[PDB]
Amino acid sequence: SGYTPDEKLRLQQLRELRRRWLKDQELSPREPVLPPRRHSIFAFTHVLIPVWIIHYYLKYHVTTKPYTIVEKKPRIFPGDTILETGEVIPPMKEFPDQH
Template sequence: MSGPVEDEKLRVQQLRALRRRWLRDQELSPREPVLPPQKLGPVAAFWERFLQPGDSWRQQVHKFYQGGRFVMLRVLLPAWAVTYYLKYHVWKSPHGVVMTNPRIFPGDRILETGEIMPPLRDEHHKHH
């Protein structure tokens, strides 16, 4: 009766060896993962070269750039878009519209003062 028990022991031993090898294969070596080099856009490539170890002023320039970009994209452009929408689509009377006074002709009454515009004096020119 040593046949089936021996076969079972051998099978269990082989399964354990396979599991151990599979687990060992799942561990990444220090060289992995091997990824293709990333293609950077022109701006990202510039900053990658610019920020190579060097002077600290480069880091400060990069921080200033990032701050300005944040302010422009997250504050100024949305504020402009909201203002534009409100000004041209929501408000009844757009901000900054200057109403011109209507033309005043001789004989018209000026509402603010109540006076009547005198007739224009005849101008005699030497031509025609």
């Protein structure tokens, strides 16, 4: 039991009407009629200007107020030299070598 002639004719008619609409969806090559309206910019207009702005805002508006930016004290080893004081750390104890 296949298609009866009525539904077959209806499906055929709707088929070429749908195909006509589908080809009618295509545009002419003239369309669209749109109305009539330096190598390293990306590394400068996005990077250097915010670097200057943030550096100024941190140097003269953020670090001026107390305790806004807190830095961990650097690691000091036996035998190191301190620029601020000049007192060199004495070396550690004589090593009881195992190997």
